[PDB]
Amino acid sequence: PLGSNIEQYIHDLDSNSFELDLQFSEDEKRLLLEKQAGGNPWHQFVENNLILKMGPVDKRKGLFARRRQLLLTEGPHLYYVDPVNKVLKGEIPWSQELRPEAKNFKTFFVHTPNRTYYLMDPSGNAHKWCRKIQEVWRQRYQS
Numbered sequence: 001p002l003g004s005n006i007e008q009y010i011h012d013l014d015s016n017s018f019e020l021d022l023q024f025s026e027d028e029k030r031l032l033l034e035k036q037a038g039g040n041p042w043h044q045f046v047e048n049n050l051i052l053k054m055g056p057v058d059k060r061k062g063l064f065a066r067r068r069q070l071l072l073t074e075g076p077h078l079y080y081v082d083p084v085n086k087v088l089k090g091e092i093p094w095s096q097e098l099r100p101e102a103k104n105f106k107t108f109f110v111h112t113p114n115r116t117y118y119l120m121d122p123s124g125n126a127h128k129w130c131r132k133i134q135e136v137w138r139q140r141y142q143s
């Protein structure tokens, strides 16, 4: 619609990384989702959920790690995708007991009851991941 400029809600950090402001309306959401479906290469992986934040992380497990595209979506969901092979590898499970924590600018954890996920962000934006996950947690679990 003329004058809608839905892109106002989108804040890019890099070519494969952005976050959304969360206060848009149900009608604006439709348009954000249409935009995503058309133009976001990760749409296929997120079950038609609007992506609220995405970007690359190195997920530590064992001695080393794997580079994954991490997607925080409506639901909420936290999906992670193998960006080379283009395959969904898993989700971080949501519940009221999920809690993010940033250790420093390049390391954050997501605590869940039976597993803590260890994520590295070499861009130095780990606090932005923590803050956004916590914003979503407040919206999901608080009035």
Ligand SMILES: O=P(O)(O)O[C@H]1[C@H](O)[C@@H](OP(=O)(O)O)[C@H](OP(=O)(O)O)[C@@H](OP(=O)(O)O)[C@H]1O
Pocket (backbone or CB within 6 Å): 059, 060, 061, 062, 065, 066, 068, 080, 089, 090
């Ligand atoms: O690739 P290799 O060296 O085999 O190591 C794998 C990857 O870290 C997996 O991540 P991804 O699924 O993103 O490929 C991880 O599963 P998670 O998805 O649970 O982190 C496996 O952990 P286990 O969870 O113990 O299987 C771990 O053994």
Ligand SMILES: [Au+]
Pocket (backbone or CB within 6 Å): 100, 101, 102, 129, 130, 131, 132, 134
């Ligand atoms: Au936080």
